[PDB]
Amino acid sequence: TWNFYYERPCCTVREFNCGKLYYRTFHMNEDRDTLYVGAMDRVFRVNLQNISSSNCNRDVINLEPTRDDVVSCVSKGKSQIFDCKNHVRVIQSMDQGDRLYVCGTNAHNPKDYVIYANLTYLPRSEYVIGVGLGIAKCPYDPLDNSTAIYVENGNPGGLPGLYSGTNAEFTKADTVIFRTDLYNTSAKRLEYKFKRTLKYDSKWLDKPNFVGSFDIGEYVYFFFRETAVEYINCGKAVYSRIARVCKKDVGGKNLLAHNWATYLKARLNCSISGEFPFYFNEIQSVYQLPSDKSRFFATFTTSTNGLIGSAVCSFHINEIQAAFNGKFKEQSSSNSAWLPVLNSRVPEPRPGTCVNDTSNLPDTVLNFIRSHPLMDKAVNHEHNNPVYYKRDLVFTKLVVDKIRIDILNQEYIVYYVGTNLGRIYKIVQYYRNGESLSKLLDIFEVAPNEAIQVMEISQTRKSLYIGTDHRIKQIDLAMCNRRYDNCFRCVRDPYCGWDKEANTCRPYELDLLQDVANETSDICDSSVLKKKIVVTYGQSVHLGCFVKIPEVLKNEQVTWYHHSKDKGRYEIRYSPTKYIETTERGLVVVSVNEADGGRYDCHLGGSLLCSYNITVDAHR
Amino acid sequence: NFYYERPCCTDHVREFNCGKLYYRTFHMNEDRDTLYVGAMDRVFRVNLQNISSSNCNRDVINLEPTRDDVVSCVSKGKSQIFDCKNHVRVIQSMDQGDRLYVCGTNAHNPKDYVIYANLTYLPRSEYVIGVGLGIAKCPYDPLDNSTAIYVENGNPGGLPGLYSGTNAEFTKADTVIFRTDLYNTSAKRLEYKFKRTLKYDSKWLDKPNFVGSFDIGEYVYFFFRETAVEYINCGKAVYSRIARVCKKDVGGKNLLAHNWATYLKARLNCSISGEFPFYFNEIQSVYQLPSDKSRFFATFTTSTNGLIGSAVCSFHINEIQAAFNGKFKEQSSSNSAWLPVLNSRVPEPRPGTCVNDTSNLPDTVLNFIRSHPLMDKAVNHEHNNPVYYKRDLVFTKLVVDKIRIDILNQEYIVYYVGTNLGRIYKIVQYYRNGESLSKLLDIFEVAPNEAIQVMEISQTRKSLYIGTDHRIKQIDLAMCNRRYDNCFRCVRDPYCGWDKEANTCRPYELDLLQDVANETSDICDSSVLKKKIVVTYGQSVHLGCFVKIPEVLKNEQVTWYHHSKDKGRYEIRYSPTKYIETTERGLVVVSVNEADGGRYDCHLGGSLLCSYNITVDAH
Ligand SMILES: *[C@@H]1O[C@H](CO)[C@@H](O[C@@H]2O[C@H](CO)[C@@H](O[C@@H]3O[C@H](CO[C@H]4O[C@H](CO[C@H]5O[C@H](CO)[C@@H](O)[C@H](O)[C@@H]5O[C@H]5O[C@H](CO)[C@@H](O)[C@H](O)[C@@H]5O)[C@@H](O)[C@H](O[C@H]5O[C@H](CO)[C@@H](O)[C@H](O)[C@@H]5O)[C@@H]4O)[C@@H](O)[C@H](O[C@H]4O[C@H](CO)[C@@H](O)[C@H](O)[C@@H]4O)[C@@H]3O)[C@H](O)[C@H]2NC(C)=O)[C@H](O)[C@H]1NC(C)=O
Ligand SMILES: *[C@@H]1O[C@H](CO)[C@@H](O[C@@H]2O[C@H](CO)[C@@H](O[C@@H]3O[C@H](CO[C@H]4O[C@H](CO[C@H]5O[C@H](CO)[C@@H](O)[C@H](O)[C@@H]5O)[C@@H](O)[C@H](O[C@H]5O[C@H](CO)[C@@H](O)[C@H](O)[C@@H]5O)[C@@H]4O)[C@@H](O)[C@H](O[C@H]4O[C@H](CO)[C@@H](O)[C@H](O)[C@@H]4O)[C@@H]3O)[C@H](O)[C@H]2NC(C)=O)[C@H](O)[C@H]1NC(C)=O
Ligand SMILES: *[C@@H]1O[C@H](CO)[C@@H](O[C@@H]2O[C@H](CO)[C@@H](O[C@@H]3O[C@H](CO[C@H]4O[C@H](CO)[C@@H](O)[C@H](O[C@H]5O[C@H](CO)[C@@H](O)[C@H](O)[C@@H]5O)[C@@H]4O)[C@@H](O)[C@H](O[C@H]4O[C@H](CO)[C@@H](O)[C@H](O)[C@@H]4O)[C@@H]3O)[C@H](O)[C@H]2NC(C)=O)[C@H](O)[C@H]1NC(C)=O
Ligand SMILES: *[C@@H]1O[C@H](CO)[C@@H](O[C@@H]2O[C@H](CO)[C@@H](O[C@@H]3O[C@H](CO[C@H]4O[C@H](CO[C@H]5O[C@H](CO)[C@@H](O)[C@H](O)[C@@H]5O)[C@@H](O)[C@H](O)[C@@H]4O)[C@@H](O)[C@H](O[C@H]4O[C@H](CO)[C@@H](O)[C@H](O)[C@@H]4O)[C@@H]3O)[C@H](O)[C@H]2NC(C)=O)[C@H](O)[C@H]1NC(C)=O
Ligand SMILES: *[C@@H]1O[C@H](CO)[C@@H](O[C@@H]2O[C@H](CO)[C@@H](O[C@@H]3O[C@H](CO)[C@@H](O)[C@H](O)[C@@H]3O)[C@H](O)[C@H]2NC(C)=O)[C@H](O)[C@H]1NC(C)=O
Ligand SMILES: *[C@@H]1O[C@H](CO)[C@@H](O[C@@H]2O[C@H](CO)[C@@H](O)[C@H](O)[C@H]2NC(C)=O)[C@H](O)[C@H]1NC(C)=O
Ligand SMILES: *[C@@H]1O[C@H](CO)[C@@H](O[C@@H]2O[C@H](CO)[C@@H](O)[C@H](O)[C@H]2NC(C)=O)[C@H](O)[C@H]1NC(C)=O
Ligand SMILES: *[C@@H]1O[C@H](CO)[C@@H](O[C@@H]2O[C@H](CO)[C@@H](O)[C@H](O)[C@H]2NC(C)=O)[C@H](O)[C@H]1NC(C)=O
Ligand SMILES: *[C@@H]1O[C@H](CO)[C@@H](O[C@@H]2O[C@H](CO)[C@@H](O)[C@H](O)[C@H]2NC(C)=O)[C@H](O)[C@H]1NC(C)=O
Ligand SMILES: *[C@@H]1O[C@H](CO)[C@@H](O)[C@H](O)[C@H]1NC(C)=O
Ligand SMILES: *[C@@H]1O[C@H](CO)[C@@H](O)[C@H](O)[C@H]1NC(C)=O
Ligand SMILES: [Cl-]
Ligand SMILES: [Cl-]
Ligand SMILES: [Cl-]
Ligand SMILES: [Cl-]
């Protein structure tokens, strides 16, 4: 039994673990080398350089509910062990990181806070006006999918405020996209009233699950999936949406003063191209690169039992704005069709555009947008197809990394996509011959049968951070020297390069070998070593390049060759009595004789992978 | 010394090949032991017992288009090699089989014929009135999907007539479901005018592709896929339909006389169950057993480029009639949703029901049905899940067979499903505990990369007949000895039985072993392959039952058990240093020692597949 390469299992890599605390909220602050984690009854300040160095009892603030709040929550039929806890669901930086805004479920009684960055309470004299009640700022239910973002700049009066998407009621009958009251916190006076979507109006929102929100220029964008109201007459479906509000929105003048006057939403299109596209309807997560505010990356799943499938799509801000600039959709009555409105038949100023004072808008614009929140055009995804899609898996969360290779400034986009079963799919995207291409590079086993709940990526520490309900894992982005003991896998990873002279994989450098796009399939040929083995007569010998072949290679074509003086190099054909194929793509040679000696070559995916030289010796 | 799956099937397989003639139309006549085949410019009279015994030049009638018809077709931009040919698309039995009704595309100028059974023309004195022009009876385009059925009984006046679904114009603008003029042949008089769907009305038909038509009781049924008009406001889809007309239909009066007065259609529902069902939207073929008119069997595919799949669904006549007895659908204006009609708004007699003279119907009934052809309820498939479905396959045609082991209590349905790549999937359906189960039994290789165009099954010759554009194949239904060299797969086939004495698979008889429904999982235990191996100490040994594991068994659970003196029977767990799993569900035991001797059992699907006895020789 002979094996060339042993690729180390990944990644059941550092861990932070304080029990099953439902680690579902991340807020990274690289300026303080900290990953803030919201969990059950707790905010942790986790060290970004090495999460294992943090202490469960020191790097924490305990926010457990009062026993009075627990009893009241239990009295309403909720569970003492899980529901009637304070699950932290918002953590946002304030005052240049000196303080944190925190919101938690607080035993189905949402409560929010402002605390110091070191996780201590403000003095009583320093309590921030307008903070305490978390209703509409974060959910009651720890299983909800909500979103929030704290926005310092661009709001009315230049005042900071929280934008949120969550359920605002214990019965879950009031989902809302929300902005808090805006205070002059020094003067202790409320300046701008809160904003909310129209209650009881299924055209604005219908059972949404929120997956992200972003502060970009003059707007705040919200990402969510919801009941597809415009599909009801044809069947049952969930659609994905991006909603947009103007930061300067102050609502209408009198009885519309608390509702958005600029709220618009559009369907998100993630689909396989064709005469009849295959749509992935349910967005699960969205991410934006720190260096690129013009793009969003998102995961989508199907809704059906019979065809489980998931995809990654990206969307450009230009295509989002084209949707919001296109025709509005209209259902003039409950039993009518949904029809486009000619843009020339829309009132002015254009609904959804940021005017100086929405409270001065004509009633005809206010009335229009209240009945036309949905755009007729869907937001097209970049390129013709998803970045990546695959059957029988449920993508959940994702982050994205952008890297440039030094030798010729080649750019690669790397997706880290979590699953409901605790795996990470590592996908690389690149452009060749005018087209967008992607390759699945690796599957990480992070936590068997533990759904990925939250992900973050640090550029200062070159690490991936992954939250499940049981643990946090930290994975180095460049696992070159540890994970790759072979040129084959090394040159396919955009973080790595193969050092032929040293026979090692290293974080990429100019002189190192790399071929992410598979343009030079012989790049590792001179690095393939020939292992010389001695086999006794009649004995069977197991030849394999990997002890366990990486899962992403299991479907590649494998060809074995034997070198003889009479045949030259010829392809080995599997037979029941001589040449057996193993599930790990190995070769078993049965009853080795003199003619079976010599060189064996294993090619995988069109590249020489490993090579053996067999010498046959007597049974001694 | 292993199980070996013999390739199949490029116990016999016969071929009829006269070149690439696009053999796409079958008409089987078992009484005359003949398979009539319609092809390019030709109808063949193929021997049903042995299709290879037929001659390409003797058992054929040449129906090539005239020079003017070719010239006219070529001048319109159509290809002379393929488009401007006479592709036969309808063959039906007439006069107790003494004559055949034939319709061909005739270089985009459809023409029809009545010929003798021996494929010779009638004399001029016998030319049949109303026969000659094939418009609305079979398509212009050889690539069109059309259907037609010649109906002898139940029409007005008791006269025979052709029912068809096809395109009636060269421009393909006018798709029609049609009934020909009904003549009294003896008296040479037209008795009833033709019937057609409402011209250019996209709510009656919208770019349909027809896959079948059936004559049942007082109705003719049509199966087709079409643009989903009731879906247009939500997106772009194709839906599958069953449509129904009363054979007694004579239309309305005045400008309504030439239109159906009983035409209804309903969506066909083939889907995987769930909170969000997965629909297979595009019906490709439909089949009825000769002995059971209460059920329809059909293939469906998806519409997408990515993540494609196909399914087989069955439909019962009780669900079909429930759809046509349900509420009508209605879009009252171009700005209206599609909604059910209140039953109090439905006039009497009920639209779509068969009356003795539809031209005597009240205005309200005729106006209602002409504006409400689509029923609100979809036709639910039996069992609420497909009989079978598979990703990444494109099903085309199918035929179905019914097997009854009658001294036992079992009944089995075997589906033969062709693919666009020349394969046949053989699926068995059976009922246990009242729930429907299915198993993929086999995958025949009929013609690599040649789409299956037409299929027929003969009970008198117990044969499967398959047509592609290049060839015709005839396959014995009982391939028992040729296909299965082992008890394990033999007992799973409803046609076959394992002979314990001769140790061979034979066509099923009483006292042979069979277990299609896996009700006796140890039935083959005494018949499985059993091998004894003497290995030397430290030597490795490869154990395996199959030379190559059959494709259809690649999904089953395989478990290896070891009987040692020190540990009894226990499950072997794979490990790179001791127990190496091999590609064909085998096992390599590495560096055998004394404790590794004994019995090794391989289980597949929970049944013993083969067994090894290892004795270790000390060195
Ligand atoms: C594939 O299968 C098919 C079906 O199985 C095969 O088809 C068979 O093919 C054969 C060969 O062609 C057919 O046989 C032949 O039939 C014809 C027609 O027969 C009928 O008409 C005859 C002529 O009638 C006129 O003339 C007589 C006599 O002068 C006169 O009394 C009549 O009144 C009539 O005259 C008038 O009408 C004319 C217009 O019709 C006017 O122009 C004219 O001026 C007058 O006004 C008639 O004699 C004949 O009668 C016979 O048959 C009937 C029953 O059908 C019977 O009742 C009678 O007593 C007679 O027995 C028919 O009414 C015929 O003309 C052919 O004759 C030649 O061949 C025979 C030998 O077979 C010789 O004896 C003759 O002298 C003559 O040379 C021949 O009989 C057959 O009908 C047909 N079968 C079917 C069911 O269609 C086909 O062959 C297969 N193909 C292959 C490749 O294998
Ligand atoms: C083909 O066969 C398959 C298998 O046999 C079959 O599958 C079932 O498919 C359904 C989905 O279609 C699965 O789910 C159920 O769906 C029921 C229907 O729900 C929808 O339709 C409602 C009615 O709409 C009609 O009326 C309007 C009027 O304006 C019209 O436009 C429409 O076109 C249509 O004609 C619609 O109201 C409803 O929307 C409301 O409710 C949802 C949430 O329920 C909400 O989000 C919306 O905002 C809106 O308020 C929806 O669009 C549904 O009734 C059913 O729910 C009951 O049963 C479940 C248990 O399954 C309970 O949990 C629930 O509380 C309800 O009591 C359920 O949701 C169903 O599971 C499949 N069944 C199987 C066995 O797989 C297909 O339907 C067949 N297809 C066809 C075309 O026939
Ligand atoms: C999400 O993002 C994806 C990818 O970016 C978008 O994908 C595009 O989707 C459309 C479908 O929505 C694909 O098809 C197009 O369909 C339209 C409309 O088609 C229908 O209406 C026609 C007019 O009424 C009718 O003629 C059509 O019927 C014919 O074709 C169908 C099959 O297509 C067939 O079944 C019929 O028998 C007819 O033969 C059909 O009912 C159509 O107008 C488009 O194109 C025509 O014109 C262009 C310009 O010349 C030509 O290039 C086309 O070939 C066609 O002739 C087109 O067919 C379209 O292919 C998808 N595009 C890609 C790149 O994949 C998707 O729309 C987005 N969704 C949303 C909600 O935004
Ligand atoms: C915020 O977003 C998240 C992410 O999208 C939402 O999370 C999803 O929530 C739903 C509903 O809560 C979850 O579904 C449930 O999972 C429960 C646990 O799973 C078991 O079964 C798994 C396998 O499933 C089996 O059944 C199917 C059915 O055909 C078979 O095909 C399959 O082969 C299996 O046999 C096991 O792997 C697992 O170990 C568990 O054993 C289920 O119990 C649950 O079903 C129950 O509830 C149904 C109604 O919800 C009811 O119909 C059933 O009868 C049963 O009572 C259901 O399947 C998703 O798993 C979860 N996704 C992720 C990624 O976490 C979340 O809901 C959302 N928040 C809000 C507030 O909406
Ligand atoms: C009648 O039904 C058949 C079967 O459903 C239809 O055939 C399908 O037709 C499409 C369109 O021509 C074929 O797709 C094409 O594939 C080729 C390459 O394979 C590509 O170059 C084309 O652009 C197109 O994508 C499809 O293969 C074919 N399927 C089979 C099984 O033949 C046919 O179109 C129907 N007839 C009419 C008139 O619609
Ligand atoms: C990350 O921090 C943890 C905890 O400080 C380190 O783990 C300890 O390392 C010391 C020194 O090697 C050992 O004596 C302890 O036994 C380790 N503890 C555990 C729980 O393993 C870890 O080495 C640090 N990782 C890096 C890369 O610095
Ligand atoms: C947590 O942070 C707060 C605020 O930064 C710290 O409080 C201050 O502590 C410094 C150091 O003694 C004083 O000079 C300031 O006057 C304090 N300000 C206030 C408002 O109290 C606090 O000491 C930190 N706590 C821990 C444990 O690190
Ligand atoms: C079916 O018909 C074919 C064709 O007549 C038969 O095959 C021929 O068999 C003879 C006798 O061995 C050969 O000389 C010919 O060369 C064969 N023809 C071809 C085209 O190969 C076949 O035996 C028949 N099968 C039966 C009767 O079961
Ligand atoms: C075929 O039938 C056998 C016998 O009932 C099935 O085996 C049983 O499976 C259940 C559930 O997995 C086990 O609890 C029993 O111990 C099994 N019995 C034996 C004797 O193995 C088997 O699963 C069936 N196979 C298929 C594919 O349905
Ligand atoms: C890499 O390229 C070779 C030939 O250039 C090809 O045979 C092989 O399939 C490719 N592998 C992958 C993973 O694309
Ligand atoms: C056709 O008409 C003739 C006489 O006109 C008659 O004998 C025959 O029965 C009619 N056929 C039918 C089917 O009614
Ligand atoms: Cl939590
Ligand atoms: Cl416009
Ligand atoms: Cl076999
Ligand atoms: Cl043809």
Instruction: For B137-195, give the DSSP string.
Output: TS-SSTT---EEEEE-SSSGGG--EEEEEEE-STTS--EEEEEPPEEETTTTEEEE--E
* List of chain A residues whose C-beta atoms are within 8 Å of the C-beta of residue B235: 234
Domain range annotation of chain B: 13-482
**H/E element holding A101?**
strand A99-104
- Ion ligand 14: residues, CB < 5 A: B 5, 489
Count H helices, E strands: chain A? Answer: 5, 44
Does B335 contact A at CB distance below 8 Å?
A: yes
Q: Determine the residue among B338, B392, B588, B596 to mutate to test chain A binding: the one whose Cβ has the most chain A Cβ atoms within 10 Å.
A: B588
Per DSSP, the three-state class of A158 is helix
Neighbours of A599 (CB within 10 A): 15
Q: How far apart are CA B171 and CA B158, in angstroms?
A: 35
Residue A260 phi/psi, 5-degree rounding, is -50, 140
- Ion ligand 15: residues, CB < 5 A: B 22, 24, 39-40, 87
User: Of all atoms in ligand 5, which is nearest to the CA of residue B451?
Assistant: 31
> Do B164 and B146 touch, CB atoms closer than 8 A?
yes
Q: Where are the alpha helices (DSSP H) in B266-413?
A: 317-325, 363-371
| CA-only gyration radius of chain A, Å | 29
Structure letter (DSSP) for residue B53: G
Task: List gaps in chain A by the residue before each (C–N > 2.5 Å).
Answer: 12
Does A304 contact B at CB distance below 8 Å?
A: yes
Q: How far apart are CA A430 and CA B560, in angstroms?
A: 45
Q: How far apart are CA A363 and CA A368, in angstroms?
A: 8
CB-CB under 8 Å, A274 with B305 = yes
Strand B379-380 with B264-269, pairing: parallel
Q: Determine the residue among A269, A313, A536, A583 to mutate to test chain B binding: the one whose Cβ has the most chain B Cβ atoms within 10 Å.
A: A583
Residue in chain A lying closest to B277 (CA): A304
> Do A22 and A29 touch, CB atoms closer than 8 A?
no
Q: How far apart are CA B347 and CA A561, in angstroms?
A: 79
Give the ligand with the smallest distance to the CA of A342. Answer: 13
- Residue B462 region by backbone torsions, left for phi larger than 0, else alpha for psi between -120 and 50, else beta: left
In 3D, which of A520, A556, A502, A530 has the Cα closest to residue A610? A530
Q: Which of A1, A539, A581 sits opposite B539 (nearest CB)?
A: A539
CB-CB under 8 Å, A547 with B576 = yes
CB-CB under 8 Å, B577 with A307 = no
- The residues facing A91 across adjacent strands are A102
Q: How far apart are CA B250 and CA A162, in angstroms?
A: 71
- Residue B531 region by backbone torsions, left for phi larger than 0, else alpha for psi between -120 and 50, else beta: beta
Q: DSSP string spanning A323-338?
A: HHHSPEEEE-STTBPE
Instruction: List Cβ neighbours of A438 (8 Å cut-off, separation of 6 or more).
Output: A387, A388, A427, A428, A429, A430
Residue A227 phi/psi, 5-degree rounding, is -55, 135
Query: Side chain identity at A67, as an amino acid letter?
Result: R
Q: How far apart are CA A177 and CA A205, in angstroms?
A: 9
Residues 521-580 of A with CB under 8 A from B: 538-540, 542, 547-548, 574, 576, 580
Q: How far apart are CA B604 and CA B608, in angstroms?
A: 6
In 3D, which of A300, A296, A293, A304 has the Cα closest to residue A388? A300
Alpha carbon of residue A608 to chain centroid: 35
**Residue A492: both structure tokens together:** 């396919």
Q: What homologous superfamily does CATH list for B13-482?
A: YVTN repeat-like/Quinoprotein amine dehydrogenase (2.130.10.10)
Residue B101 phi/psi, 5-degree rounding, is -95, 125
Q: Which of B275, B307, B586 sits opposite A307 (nearest CB)?
A: B307
Q: How far apart are CA B107 and CA B528, in angstroms?
A: 59
Does B104 contact A at CB distance below 8 Å?
A: no
Q: Tell me how long chain B is.
A: 619
> Do B243 and B222 touch, CB atoms closer than 8 A?
yes
Distances (CA, A) of A458 to A24, A422, A475, B283: 17, 20, 10, 51
Structure letter (DSSP) for residue B374: B
Q: How far apart are CA B467 and CA B16, in angstroms?
A: 9
Q: Is B153 exposed, middle or buried (0-12, 13-18, 19+ CB in 10 A)?
A: exposed
Evaluate the omega torsion of the peptide bond into residue A448 and state whether it is cis, within 30 degrees of 0.
no
Instruction: List Cβ neighbours of A156 (8 Å cut-off, separation of 6 or more).
Output: A182, A191, A192, A247, A248, A250
Give the ligand with the smallest distance to the CA of A345. Answer: 13
Q: How far apart are CA B446 and CA B14, in angstroms?
A: 11
Any atom of ligand 9 within 6 Å of the Cβ of B518? yes
Structure letter (DSSP) for residue B582: B
Q: CA dihedral in degrees (A46, A52, A56, A60; nearest 10)?
A: -10
CA-angle at A415, arms to A409 and A419, nearest 5°: 170
Give the ligand with the smallest distance to the CA of B22. Answer: 15
Query: Counting one residue from A and one from B, how many pairs have CB atoms under 8 Å apart?
Result: 144
CB-CB under 8 Å, A307 with B274 = no
Long-range Cβ contact pairs of A573-579 (< 8 A, separation 24 or more): A574/B583, A576/B2, A576/B544, A576/B547, A576/B584
Neighbours of B342 (CB within 10 A): 10
**Residue A406: both structure tokens together:** 């030094």
- Residue whose CB lies within 8 A of the most ligand 9 atoms, among B521, B522, B523, for a mutation test: B521
In 3D, which of B309, B552, B276, B272 has the Cα closest to residue B387? B272
> Do B246 and B324 touch, CB atoms closer than 8 A?
no
Does B394 contact A at CB distance below 8 Å?
A: no
- The residues facing A416 across adjacent strands are A399, A426
Sign of the C-alpha dihedral, residues B65, B70, B76, B77? positive
Q: CA dihedral in degrees (A115, A121, A127, A129; nearest 10)?
A: 40
Structure letter (DSSP) for residue A107: T
Residue with token string 């990402």: A223
Cited resolution, angstroms: 2.0
Residue spans of beta strands (DSSP E) within A182-235? 182-184, 189-192, 195-196, 209-216, 219-227
CB-CB under 8 Å, B337 with A233 = yes
**Residue B549: both structure tokens together:** 């594991």
Sign of the C-alpha dihedral, residues B383, B147, B150, B424? negative
Count H helices, E strands: chain B? Answer: 5, 44
- Ion ligand 13: residues, CB < 5 A: A 342-343
Evaluate the omega torsion of the peptide bond into residue A480 and state whether it is cis, within 30 degrees of 0.
no
Q: How far apart are CA A374 and CA A324, in angstroms?
A: 9
**Residue A271: both structure tokens together:** 């689909």
CA of A546 to the centre of ligand 10 (A): 19
Strand B13-16 with B472-476, pairing: antiparallel
**H/E element holding A75?**
helix A67-75
Q: How far apart are CA B576 and CA B580, in angstroms?
A: 6
Q: How far apart are CA B543 and CA B536, in angstroms?
A: 15
> Do B91 and B35 touch, CB atoms closer than 8 A?
no
Evaluate the omega torsion of the peptide bond into residue B9 and state whether it is cis, within 30 degrees of 0.
yes
Neighbours of A580 (CB within 10 A): 23
Q: DSSP string spanning B409-470?
A: TEEEEEEEEEETTSEEEEEEEEEETTEEEEEEEEEEESSTT----EEEEETTTTEEEEE-SS
Domain A2-481, classified CATH 2.130.10.10, yes or no: yes
Q: Determine the residue among B304, B332, B612 to mutate to test chain A binding: the one whose Cβ has the most chain A Cβ atoms within 10 Å.
A: B304
Nearest CA of chain B to the CA of A446: how many Å? 22
User: Of all atoms in ligand 4, which is nearest to the CA of residue A145?
Assistant: 1
> Do B426 and B418 touch, CB atoms closer than 8 A?
no
